[PDB]
Design brief:
Length: about 500
């Protein structure tokens, strides 16, 4: 009969399935299909991509979340819980002979006024202050899941993201790279000065240690050339067999000799080399290597300032580059020259050590994520009181502003402020504490001239400061989440009624 009731009601069912999955701790709800593949995932968008929707109107509320996920990723679920709340309150006002045009006018006006509030409530932090940066380091280590050593693994990350920052103050995730390797503990990860390669030579004949040496960059191959004009190969002399085995082997003896005369003690080529040529390198003392990734040849010259060369047939003395820092060290046996820097890198690599691959994979997925959550702060430079601590403050500012606007539209403005009280409610119900009995204390702090970084701690379970413990998130997440929900929920209310259109393509 009403039609619109079934539409707004369908959206609530989608929020309840993701309302309890908010915050770090939260149970999961798997929805296995009739196939048999049983999968479980706590993330939000992962459940939306695999879900059998009932009504077609529900797709409108899901499309708006996919666009926000590709931008920031985190915070998309925060806009769905608020949607299900502001829609439920519409029923309480719809029965009061209130037309949807008056309700939509409140959200559009209240959402715009909120833009001028987060700018003042947000805190300013510089992308250099170590006193404030170290505090953000311990905030991310606790969110993911690794409190066994939040003091050592956090300090190494502070000096990493803070050193790879460019002059303008930006940073990208492509410059960070993670690896894995066995070890005795998790405190051996350090940094020296140089560059590392992600591939090792497939032989044990060339030298293995040469103190004080120069680096040489090569890229050319050794395959037979090919003329542009077409042609066909024809063989009619079976005698040609026991000739190229010795002739081809001689073309490399004189080629490698030119490399030593130029003054290159180290070499990093791509293709392979005959065995006889490798024996000479051992007596001459030229710790050479082969098989290198293309992306690796770009950071050797950009860090140490070497001169990258593309041709191997010609190699003069000027083509020599320069080494950064050579030092000896054993890697659970063989001793190579592995050193990395962080002043002006291109693809820094960290050697994670551990006793078992289990703990290594856990911390391995934490260092790469630490640069993502922190990389955004280095670019923007504006943070707020996350963890539902910034919404309680807006509840007091909107009420004072609602008194200025008169008429029947003031009812929708007050409902918007109260609708934001669901963020701390869901986080409280998951911990087992009565929200009605704790929400009265958090408001007491924000009574007049109280701190603005106050909130509730899920661990201790008491009112504390957010900037002190560790609850911080970017600004674009909260600001865009409220704006995205305002423009996403209005599309559901502006629908006059269903239509029986035929042949909808």
């Amino acid at each position: 009969r009403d039609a619109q009731r079934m539409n707004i009601l369908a959206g609530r069912i989608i929020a309840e399935t993701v309302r309890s999955t908010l915050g770090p701790k939260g149970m999961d709800k798997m929805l296995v299909d009739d196939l048999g593949d049983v999968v479980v995932t706590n993330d939000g968008v992962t459940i939306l991509r695999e879900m059998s929707v009932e009504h077609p109107a529900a797709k409108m509320l899901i499309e708006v979340a996919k666009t926000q996920e590709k931008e920031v990723g985190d915070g998309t679920t925060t806009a769905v819980v608020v949607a299900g709340e502001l829609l439920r309150k519409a029923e309480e006002l719809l029965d009061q002979n209130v037309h949807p045009t008056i309700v939509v006018k409140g959200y559009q006006a209240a959402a715009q006024k909120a833009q001028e509030l987060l700018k003042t409530i947000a805190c300013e932090v510089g992308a250099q202050d170590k006193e404030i940066l170290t505090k953000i380091a311990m905030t991310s280590i606790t969110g993911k899941g690794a409190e066994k050593a939040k003091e050592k693994l956090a300090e190494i990350i502070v000096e990493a993201v803070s050193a790879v920052v460019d002059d303008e103050g930006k940073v990208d995730k492509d410059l960070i790279k993670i690896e894995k390797k066995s070890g005795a503990s998790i405190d051996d990860t350090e940094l020296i000065k140089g560059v590392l390669v992600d591939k090792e030579r497939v032989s044990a004949q060339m030298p293995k240690k040469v103190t004080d040496a120069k680096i040489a960059l090569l890229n050319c191959a050794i395959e037979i050339k090919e003329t542009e004009t077409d042609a066909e190969i024809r063989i009619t002399d079976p005698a040609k067999l026991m000739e190229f085995i010795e002739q081809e082997e001689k073309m490399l003896k004189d080629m490698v000799a030119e490399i030593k005369a130029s003054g290159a003690n180290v070499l990093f080529c791509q293709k392979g080399i005959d065995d006889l040529a490798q024996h000479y390198l051992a007596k001459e003392g030229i710790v050479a290597a082969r098989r290198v990734k293309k992306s690796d040849m770009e950071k050797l010259a950009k860090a140490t300032g070497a001169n990258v060369i593309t041709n191997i047939k010609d190699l003069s003395a000027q083509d020599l580059g320069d080494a950064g820092l050579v030092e000896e060290r054993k890697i659970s046996g063989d001793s190579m020259i592995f050193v990395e820097e962080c002043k002006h890198p291109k693809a820094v690599t960290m050697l994670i050590r551990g006793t078992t691959e289990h703990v290594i994979e856990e911390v391995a997925r934490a260092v790469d994520d630490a640069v993502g959550v922190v990389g955004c702060t280095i670019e923007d430079g504006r943070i707020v009181s996350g963890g539902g601590s910034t919404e309680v403050e807006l509840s007091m500012k909107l009420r004072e502003y609602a008194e200025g606007i008169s008429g029947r539209e003031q009812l929708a403005v007050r409902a918007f402020a109260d609708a934001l009280e669901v963020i701390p409610r869901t986080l409280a119900e998951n911990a087992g504490l009565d929200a009605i009995e704790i929400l009265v204390k958090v408001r007491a702090a924000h009574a007049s001239n109280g701190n603005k970084c106050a909130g509730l701690n899920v661990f201790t379970g008491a009112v504390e400061d957010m900037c002190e413990n560790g609850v911080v998130e970017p600004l674009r997440v909260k600001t865009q989440a409220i704006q995205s929900a305002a423009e996403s929920t209005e599309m559901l209310l502006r629908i006059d009624d269903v239509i029986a259109a035929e042949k909808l393509r």
